[PDB]
Design a protein around this ligand. Sequence first.
Ligand SMILES: [Zn+2]
Ligand SMILES: [Zn+2]
Lengths: 138, 426, 244, 48, 48, 8, 103, 192, 114
Amino acid sequence: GPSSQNVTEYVVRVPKNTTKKYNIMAFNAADKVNFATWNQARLERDLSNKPEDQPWLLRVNGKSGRKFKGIKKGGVTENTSYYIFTQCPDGAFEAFPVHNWYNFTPLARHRTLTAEEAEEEWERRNKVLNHFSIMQQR
Amino acid sequence: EITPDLWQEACWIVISSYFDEKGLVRQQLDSFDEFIQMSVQRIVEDAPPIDLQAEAQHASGEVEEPPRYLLKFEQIYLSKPTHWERDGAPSPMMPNEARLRNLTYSAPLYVDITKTVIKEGEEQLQTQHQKTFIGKIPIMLRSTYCLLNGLTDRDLCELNECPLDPGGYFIINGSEKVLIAQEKMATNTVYVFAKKDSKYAYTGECRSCLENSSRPTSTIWVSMLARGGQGAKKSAIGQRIVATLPYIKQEVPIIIVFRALGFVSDRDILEHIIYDFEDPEMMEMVKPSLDEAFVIQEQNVALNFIGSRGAKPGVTKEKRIKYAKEVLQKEMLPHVGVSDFCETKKAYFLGYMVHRLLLAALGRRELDDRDHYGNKRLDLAGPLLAFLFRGMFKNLLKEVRIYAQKFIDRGKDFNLELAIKTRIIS
Amino acid sequence: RDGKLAKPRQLHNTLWGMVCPAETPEGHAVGLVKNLALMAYISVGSQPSPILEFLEEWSMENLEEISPAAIADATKIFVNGCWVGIHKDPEQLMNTLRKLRRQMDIIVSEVSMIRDIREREIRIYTDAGRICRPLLIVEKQKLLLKKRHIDQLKEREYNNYSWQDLVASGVVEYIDTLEEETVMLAMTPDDLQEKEVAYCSTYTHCEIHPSMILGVCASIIPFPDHNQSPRNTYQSAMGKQAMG
Amino acid sequence: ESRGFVENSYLAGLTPTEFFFHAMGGREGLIDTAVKTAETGYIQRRLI
Amino acid sequence: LSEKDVDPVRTTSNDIVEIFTVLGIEAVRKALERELYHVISFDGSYVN
Amino acid sequence: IWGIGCNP
Amino acid sequence: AERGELDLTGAKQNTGVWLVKVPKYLSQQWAKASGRGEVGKLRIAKTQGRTEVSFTLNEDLANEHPFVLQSVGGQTLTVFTESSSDKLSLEGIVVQRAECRPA
Amino acid sequence: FHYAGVSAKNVTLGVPRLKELINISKKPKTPSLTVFLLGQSARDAERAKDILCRLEHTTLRKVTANTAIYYDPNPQSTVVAEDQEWVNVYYEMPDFDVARISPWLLRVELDRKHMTDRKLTMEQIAEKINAGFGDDLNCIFNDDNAEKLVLRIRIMNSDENKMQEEEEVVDKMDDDVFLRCIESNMLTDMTL
Amino acid sequence: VGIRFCQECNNMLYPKEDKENRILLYACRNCDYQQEADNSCIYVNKITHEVDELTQIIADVSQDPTLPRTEDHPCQKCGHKEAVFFQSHSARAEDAMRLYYVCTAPHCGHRWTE
Ligand SMILES: [Zn+2]
Ligand SMILES: [Zn+2]
């Protein structure tokens, strides 16, 4: 059929300015990120100082869902540029420059050892007893 | 189109051309030449711009309270070697006359200095003092900046200098001094050595430096502790990897260091450390160190662990965390990166160091040889004089700051010419 | 000098062609003070930026997704430190780099590129301290140096042909100790490169002349190969003390 | 030949690789002498 | 020494400290003399 | 310089 | 519905996007005018069991760019935009990566 | 170096040996002991080799080809296919299973060459291990005729049942961590 | 034999005996995830550590000019005459002067020890 020899050629458009800037959101494959359960999400600048030059915090499905941290790419692309091609009804590709690159990594929604207790536990480095029971106690 | 059995003429013709273009001392000369140009500009550029304002407590009100004074060193210049007589007229100094009169063969060094002053009225004023004289640099003979350079043998004879003299030395106080190339270990290179009597079975060292812009070296160790020590848990766990990070009083477990770089998950840490997950032996090697760091499962907790072991303790908890983070971003693995999101690069390189230690322990790679001259570098005139100028230019900036601060606290004014002490560099 | 360990002092094999074997001071400094060989040259240093730009252009994807993958990505491109990415193809990259060294675009003569085929790592060192020596280049079993180059050099003056032109042609190359580890050398073209009972058929370089392994003071010694080795060190020391 | 053996005599003249290996051996001898002088002197002083 | 089929009379150790602790000060005198004589006379040099 | 049993 | 909410409609529609690494000369040629709405034409030719991608530079712009594909199974990428109205949105998921090389 | 090799045993000589003797250093660089044989053992090489074996330190690690820890839920289950026979034999008339059996099994496998060189016996090794550690470690030893020399070690039966311990029912060092500690101890400290 | 990681937090699992059903498990300590043990083997240690180094030899090694090669031993797969041989090139190899062979010519990379 036509699929074995189809040739597709489309116009390329690069608007001078776009109201919304374009970024890259990269998830590690082993994380098994799935968007079906992403009913809601919250992306905001971090507050670890407790703005434009600070990392990003993502909280999917509120506190109940997984949280991810995104850090801009340190290596600048002084000799490289990245563009994204999106399908449009007019049938012409549109290219938008990548303003920023972010790698998001998740944090488990598991109980977290308090810093004081963690220091006390490390004082007993030779934990002869099972560590799993220790985690259960906390 | 071959030259067989005529080779004895060929090798010596090519050697003749070699020694005709260069000569024997081309190391020293070339080093010095490179040094001057590149190094001095670089250092003058790399040094932080001088920031300065009057103390708020000293004067009441905020109308003129921050008179910010900013000093930037734009560009470097060197004149031909010059002697300033007692009358004060500059004169060209021939090397022979410098030897005879016990003078120093040196050239004046001029830096353009731009002073920008903000009076808090938003009317910042920039005044550029061009060709400000900061010091005198001794000039290596027959280098590009020596007067003898580019002179035919007849011209050299007119100046009572030998045509055959190699150069490559400085006339300091009328005496010829030769910088001797100093051997050193290679920088920015991971080397795994074994110390027999140490508590570590193997140690991997990287004498990291950022293009020698500052901080001659920032050495970091990743070493696997020996299993010779006997204890119940010690026998169970086996050898554990520890990191002797710079500016830290004692050893830090390696997995904690990786989590401090933001890589909390064990899988990700091992991805950096163990490039092939399939190999069982290396995974077994890394298991005990993970057991040691099982307590700390968060980046902030790991930073606090590092800060607690820092050489100077921080009273505040968040002070310790911030101190550890800044210390890692600067001191640890400086050559990989020094700011922003170089954390991933530092994690990959530290994982490479741990991986190389694992390969040495498993026997997959041989231990590095200290005497292998590939692992050695030679510091010629250029690197040594560059280190000297780094130190002395920093001291000159410090003295300028001191004089400036006194006059600024008065609020009278500041003069760049008075602040610069040529004595320092010269 | 106080340390009595007979290990920092001994003449290492890597010193070949770059530090004089004979010329060493005798006393507390035996083997601790050394002297450059006649043909040795020391790197003055260079900016690594153009090399990194070339590597980015060729391939060397950085911030890859755990692509080393049992070093399936053959080799890991290092520069003066700084793992800067990895390449799937490590022989093509090395050959392209050698061609660039010839054309002198991104690689000055001093830039040293090392590929460790086992351990899959390419080091690309330009760090201003490396001691390197000129070696002729052997392609197949034939030296690249030919009668055209030698005839032009023989007419050196009023022909405006020099050593730098020999380097630019790609006939000669500067190899440092790291590269000396990865290079098959022939002492002499006729004796070694020519077909015989095949010791090696993969010579990559040839020494310009063996005698250059000696320093300035040891070079004056006539028939040094016919003397006992300590007797050449003594002559170096004594020639530094001759009256002339 | 690879590991150091020098078949040529002094009168015949060492080949280049043989020359470097011979230099290595002579260097070891010289280092031994220089290092030995201090240890033996310390021992002698202690005994006396 | 106390192992079966080991000669008690002639079995000797190079360590003078072990000889002291096990066999006495006179035995360590003779053993020290033997060891010193061995190291001196291995070269063939004779000391009275 | 002689052999393993001789001198270096 | 809040300021920090992310419009995941693009993810729901499973919009596929292509990521390409292009050189500085091409990007600078595009940036020269950057307002004419046209920079070149992307031509994809498919055969029985092989596909090739190429880009032709505009004739006005110049006064062939083959594309090499890369596997995207080792990493999942998505594109999100921060609107000037503080309304974050997701444009789509990256389904293919390509590199542009000089001729 | 340059010392004549009369025997394959290195000896300090020259200035360093003089330093050791004159300093009366507690740690000699090469402590050595010359042993003369009293009886016919001196004349006959086999008896001398017996004395050599009796006088040379041998750890379990020297004769152990490879060690593995398998979680075996039942002795009859015989997760390792090979032991199924010999386990059955030992459990035809089971001994010390009355208290209980350990759910973890340390299946050490010894190299026949090392065993025959040191002339060690499976009963000898098993007796040393079981007696020195006590009733807590129970060891099953293969026949020498079997191709694989296998020692199956299990933790204390009474400790597994916990009737003997009484006190609090709390695991100490789990069981597999304790078994790994036991394995390291056996590897370097058996002194067979 | 190998190490496996949790599917929620990607941390390291640990073996735990199931006391009720007598079935080995792996349970992450930082969450409640549990997965039964399929392999039934946990800690394997090879003291002689006899490992075929053919697994550690890279085919790319056939491109090294500094290695020796012979035409005597042909390859098994393609029957190519050139074969580049080298020793263990490994520390703690016990005592092995055995020659390892790698087939030259592109992409074959077959390794046979004789
Ligand atoms: Zn988990
Ligand atoms: Zn083949």
